[PDB]
Amino acid sequence: LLIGVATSSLALHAPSQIVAAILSRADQLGASVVVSMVERSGVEACKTAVHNLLAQRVSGLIINYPLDDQDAIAVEAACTNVPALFLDVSDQTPINSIIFSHEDGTRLGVEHLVALGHQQIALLAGPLSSVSARLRLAGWHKYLTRNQIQPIAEREGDWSAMSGFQQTMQMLNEGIVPTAMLVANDQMALGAMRAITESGLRVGADISVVGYDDTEDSSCYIPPLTTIKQDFRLLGQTSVDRLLQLSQGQAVKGNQLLPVSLVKRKTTLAP
Amino acid sequence: LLIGVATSSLALHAPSQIVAAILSRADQLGASVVVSMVERSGVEACKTAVHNLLAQRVSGLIINYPLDDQDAIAVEAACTNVPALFLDVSDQTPINSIIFSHEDGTRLGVEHLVALGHQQIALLAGPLSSVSARLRLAGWHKYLTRNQIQPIAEREGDWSAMSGFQQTMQMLNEGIVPTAMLVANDQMALGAMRAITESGLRVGADISVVGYDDTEDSSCYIPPLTTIKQDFRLLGQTSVDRLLQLSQGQAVKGNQLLPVSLVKRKTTLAP
């Protein structure tokens, strides 16, 4: 038994956690895994990865790469009837997929800050080339609007701590000082926290911060980071079970949404 | 062209960075990669992984799993004449390998602290079940001894930030307060830094900290972490080039040591 995985760079935290879980579950079920890391940027790069995987005679494909509606459909077409499961797409795209609830994750972050009394909020989005970053940013805007709040600033990073530091420092140097920040992932949040601290402000007391992912490291940031938990292990594990069920015609044909939750720590307080 | 990789959990930072580089270089050279994640703990688990990889008809193997001398030799024997390259072993083991210079990494950390004037030093080692953690701990002791210093305490963690936090808090709660700490990796260092800070002390000014790896996140810890850079991308990239050369009988037959360097940041000051 052999399956193939087309994945975003494993140098990134989220992708590596998902693939680790995929490999663990595959081993458990007696399936070997061919892994192809996408050259990044573009549906063509992903199609090439899929082509190479099919050449290795895989009987199932897990696409752990961000794709918009049309591109995901295009990649599915390239799988040549071999079952394909997508893990980084919109839940509206008509393909087989499993993704985390972006509606719940963004609502949780916004409602948490609103409930604490925050009105001056800034957003630090992930790279908009990524469907996940886009869904997250759209969600923040949706719930902030529902709470009759317009953010005082919104910027874009690249998932790295340094981008969080740079974007936050640029915002602060501009004279824009929110009482709270919604950040696209924990690593960028770490960067934001450093920027806040080096600017002579207190994370939490002066500027609250909410991350996203609930990485193992987040519990030890200074101070511990309030974030949105995305159970990557569960996603990876479930993707293998699902793919094998699909390959045997006993699964389904559509999208599954996995729940997320708010992890309250030490970076969020009333303004 | 197809190669196989037996690897430690990709949930771990170092392994994921190495494998990412392996996949990138493999793609560049037109080689597909079958990846097997070891069930952890034991030479038997690694042998099983190798067996499954050989069943997929790989023509080369990269062993990215910690193995002592005898176990590495045993795993090599199990590769059935298929070229095998080890990335987590001692450089004294008579097999093909590429590892970072532990002698240089430990000397750099010790000499940096000694040069700053530190005499009261504590050690926080990685899990001793890992050859890398063992070589690192032995190295610290070697150079501390050469500088006529006996550490005031030495503990063991598990590579995670939480283990660094727990071990450091336990040390401090015991009344053992060093002026500097040598920590086995950046994540455990993050945990130590949190413990120090929550104990009412200043990282750097009160207790200096040196990490290991130079993770992307380390530049944004609070404060930025002085550490030892291990270029995982270079290691992964080089391992692919080396394996293919070995498969064509144009490489060598032995160990290569990759250099490391000290990255001075904000967590190390005179006592």
In this structure, which amino acid lies at residue A54?
Answer: L
Q: Is A175 helix (H, G, I), strand (E, B) or coil?
A: coil
Rounded Cα distance between A11 and A112, Å, is: 31
Residue B167 distance to chain A (closest CA, Å)? 13
Nearest-CA neighbor of B163 among B112, B212, B113, B125? B125
Rounded Cα distance between B267 and B107, Å, is: 18
Domain A1-100+230-259 fold: Rossmann fold (3.40.50)
CB contact under 8 A, B164 and A193: no
Rounded Cα distance between B62 and B46, Å, is: 12
Give the residue on B whose Cα is nearest the Cα of A224: B194
Instruction: Please name the residues in contact with B255: beta carbons below 8 A apart, sequence gap of 6 or more.
Output: B91, B93, B95, B96, B97, B98, B99
Rounded Cα distance between A53 and B14, Å, is: 26
A-B contacts (CB, under 8 Å): 118
Q: What is the DSSP string of B59-126?
A: S-EEEES---HHHHHHHHHHTTTS-EEESSS-TTSSS-EEEE-HHHHHHHHHHHHHHHT--SEEEEE-
CB contact under 8 A, A216 and B161: yes
Asked, as a colleague might, if the bond just before B178 is cis with ω within 30 of 0, I would say no
Nearest-CA neighbor of B132 among B67, B191, B177, B187? B67
- Is residue A35 within 8 Å of residue A253, measured between CB atoms? no
Q: Is A127 helix (H, G, I), strand (E, B) or coil?
A: coil
- Kind and range of the H or E element at A235? helix A232-247
Which pairs from B81-85 meet CB under 8 Å and 24+ separation? B82/B54, B82/B58, B83/B59, B83/B243, B83/B246, B83/B247, B84/B50, B84/B60, B85/B60, B85/B61, B85/B239, B85/B242, B85/B243, B85/B246
Nearest-CA neighbor of B98 among B243, B269, B216? B243
Rounded Cα distance between B124 and B143, Å, is: 15
SS (H, E, C) A27-58: HHCCCEEEEEECCCCCHHHHHHHHHHHHCCCC
Q: Which residues of B touch A10 (CB under 8 A)?
A: 10, 16-17, 19-20, 23
B 53-82 residues with CB below 8 A of A? 53, 55-56
For chain A, the structural domain boundaries read 1-100+230-259, 101-229+260-271
Residue B148 distance to chain A (closest CA, Å)? 34
Q: Is the Cβ of B197 closer than 8 Å to some Cβ of chain A?
A: yes
Rounded Cα distance between B92 and A193, Å, is: 44
Nearest-CA neighbor of B95 among B106, B108, B84, B105? B84
Q: Is B259 helix (H, G, I), strand (E, B) or coil?
A: coil
At A173, list the tokens: 């140097």
Q: How many CB atoms lie within 10 A of CB A52?
A: 18
* Helices and strands in chain A: count of H runs, count of E runs: 8, 12
Q: Is the Cβ of B33 closer than 8 Å to some Cβ of chain A?
A: yes
At B56, list the tokens: 């997929």
**Would you say domain B101-229+260-271 falls under CATH 3.40.50.2300?**
yes
For residue B197, give the nearest of A37, A191, A222 by CB distance.
Answer: A222
Rounded Cα distance between B145 and B143, Å, is: 5
Q: Is the Cβ of B258 closer than 8 Å to some Cβ of chain A?
A: no
Nearest-CA neighbor of A21 among B19, B11, B262, B55? B11
Rounded Cα distance between B119 and B178, Å, is: 9
In this structure, which amino acid lies at residue B194?
Answer: R
Q: Is the Cβ of A33 closer than 8 Å to some Cβ of chain B?
A: yes
- Is residue A59 within 8 Å of residue A2, measured between CB atoms? yes
Q: How was this structure determined?
A: X-ray
- The DSSP bridge pattern shows strands B97-100 and B121-125 to be unpaired
CB contact under 8 A, B32 and A32: no
Nearest-CA neighbor of A189 among A229, A157, A236? A157
Rounded Cα distance between A206 and B111, Å, is: 39
Asked, as a colleague might, if the bond just before B223 is cis with ω within 30 of 0, I would say yes
Instruction: Please name the residues in contact with B207: beta carbons below 8 A apart, sequence gap of 6 or more.
Output: B177, B178, B179, B180, B181, B196, B201
Q: Give the mutation candidate from A28, A166, A190, A220 for the B interface (greatest B CB count, under 10 A).
A: A220
* Cα of A208 vs its chain's centroid, Å: 21
Instruction: Please name the residues in contact with B173: beta carbons below 8 A apart, sequence gap of 6 or more.
Output: none
Declared resolution, Å: 1.7
Q: Which residues of B touch A192 (CB under 8 A)?
A: none
Q: How many CB atoms lie within 10 A of CB A176?
A: 13
